[model samples]
Target: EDYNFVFKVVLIGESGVGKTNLLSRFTRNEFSHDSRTTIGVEFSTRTVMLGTAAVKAQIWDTAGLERYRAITSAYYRGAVGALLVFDLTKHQTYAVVERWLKELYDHAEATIVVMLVGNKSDLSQAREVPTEEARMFAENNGLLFLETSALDSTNVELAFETVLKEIFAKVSKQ
Candidate 1:
């Protein structure tokens, strides 16, 4: 709803949770199975036309390690929304997701919208995090949660669109 019709969002999650991979898959519709580590941060932009309000999503992808803690705040400067990601196959990622939530609360403005995302859903056999538990966490924290599979290009695209549409609804006060 801003006059400039631009939206900024940040993605935060633990190491090796496919945050960068997801961003690559979302923006370019392609991703590698062997995902690499993101040092400080990564960035990508994709514009979603909203007719009267064109939304240019400036995505700031952040690191999950303690060393980059200071840089985490820098990505949050103009962010209006956030995507807190977790690896579905790694239970420890949930603890990291908790840290991500705290990071948002600590650095970003109070009213910034946050969405919880459980990634790598295609690996059901290796899945360690339960959907029920994730949903409960989202409910407790007042967030909308989505399970995503970037390996499956179609689902990843849908997941990104879902997050944008959900945030857009809030922005439009719908």
Candidate 2:
């Protein structure tokens, strides 16, 4: 009786950028420093209470490998939200944000809520992409953005909560 709405959220990014780890950590609160590359797509569900409504988020994490991209169209079905993730320590990962964004909007509904996530924030010394730079990109692209670390659980829940809340707000208004 605690659930009200079900939101399908997709995680998109390049391989080894910590998309799988982010999903596992968000849904299970477990983080692995050495997670293997996702082969295709995997998903998990978790319930969160937003205001008076219980939101059940069904999160989809896709393989970053190009070969698996063709098989992930099915994964985009019914998605109401997306989290575009990139490694903060790697600038190349951030460079692919536009491609992922296009890929997400290409299949998902037009009203899909999107969040740009800069993961691995704990490795600040190794960060090649600055927070301001990421924020600017997010602002320019009209996406909600946050820096998170699955290893330390930094802003992980906040990122999900913000996006879910945004989606909830939009759905509730409609």
Candidate 3:
């Protein structure tokens, strides 16, 4: 069921949390300062060869909504990584994290690694989802949490490398 290695990454969260913006930056190396909301789940593909294998990643950028959640639930299968993002400016977004956690439990297996990402991290002064709070929630839910600003050109280098480090408890790779 595997060809060397491939991973499915899904972005799920509420509206206005910057899910689409983050996805766009990651996929296209571009950014939108005034982007609109996503209508439905959108997907894209990118591949990176690890060792001797070219591993493909299927990225699903889902609509940010509560009502449409039922619709988005269909893409749960085969997802290796789930990025549970939230708006740092809104603390209530942190409240709904459990619901997202529950979704992972109901759909994803235990082996699936979840990342609790606090988007809009650059707006720290206006941030409502305190890092400690989100970190505790992530820890309790057995997930990895982080702060990232899509506008920043280098918030990350290799996506797979970060996950590999976490899973294997190795030092950060350049």
Candidate 4:
């Protein structure tokens, strides 16, 4: 209620993609490798200045169990942005992004700002997904793309802020 704008953003992908860590890093400035698997949904909020307006980012982290069972539409309700994350070291996680995108589009707002995040950049030596490959996918699908390492605090802030800024641009214009 204190913010000029409230943006609901979601983090999604296969399990072990570091979605939780991304949220922790952005909101709490902390990361834990042993964090337990998300059971349903968890959220954290942080307010930031987007130009002159204060934007509160309410980020949601979902369980990878959505792969087996359908997720309730309530999870996507009011979501203005999403970070579709994939582990850079695991091609299998990246491979199923299409399915996740479909699920996102089906439930979230049509104009929802989406970003394709390749996480775990600190493990580049063992990377399985090419940067160009994911970049091309994001381009073709009209998503903002970035590589982040929650473990090392790389691009974590920029990622969330970029999405928040994009949402601000759209809502402010309207």
- Candidate 1, poorest ten consecutive residues by summed lDDT: 62-71
As a TM-score, model 1 comes out at 0.84
What is the TM-score ranking, best to worst?
Answer: 4, 2, 1, 3
| Residue ranges of candidate 4 with Cα displaced over 4 Å | 36-39, 64-71
lDDT of 2 by residue, 34-135 (tens): 765446677899999998789999988766435245676788889888898999999999998898787777778888889999999999889999999999
Best by TM-score: 4
lDDT, model 2: 0.87
How do the residues 1-174 of candidate 4 rate in per-residue lDDT, one tens digit apiece? 569888999988988999999999999998998876546778999999988899999989866436345565878889999999999999999999999899888889888999999999999999999999999999999899999999999999999999999999998787
Give a tens-digit lDDT track for model 3, residues 1-174: 244445677777777787777777776776897765457667766665455555566677765434346764567776777788888899887778888777667776666667888888778889887789888888887787788787774453344345533433321221
Q: Each model's number of backbone clashes?
A: 0, 0, 0, 0
Residue pairs with backbone atoms closer than 3 Å in model 1 (clashes) = none
What would the per-residue lDDT of candidate 1 be over residues 1-174, giving only the tens digit for each residue? 344456677887887877787788877776886666556667788877555666767777755535356675677877777878888999998877776677678778866777788888888689998999999989999787888887775366656666676677777783
Model 4 lDDT vs. the true structure? Answer: 0.91
The best-first sequence of candidates by lDDT reads 4, 2, 1, 3
Q: Which ranges of candidate 2 are over 4 A from the true structure?
A: 36-39, 64-70
How well does candidate 4 score on lDDT at residue 6? 85
Better of 2 and 3 by lDDT: 2
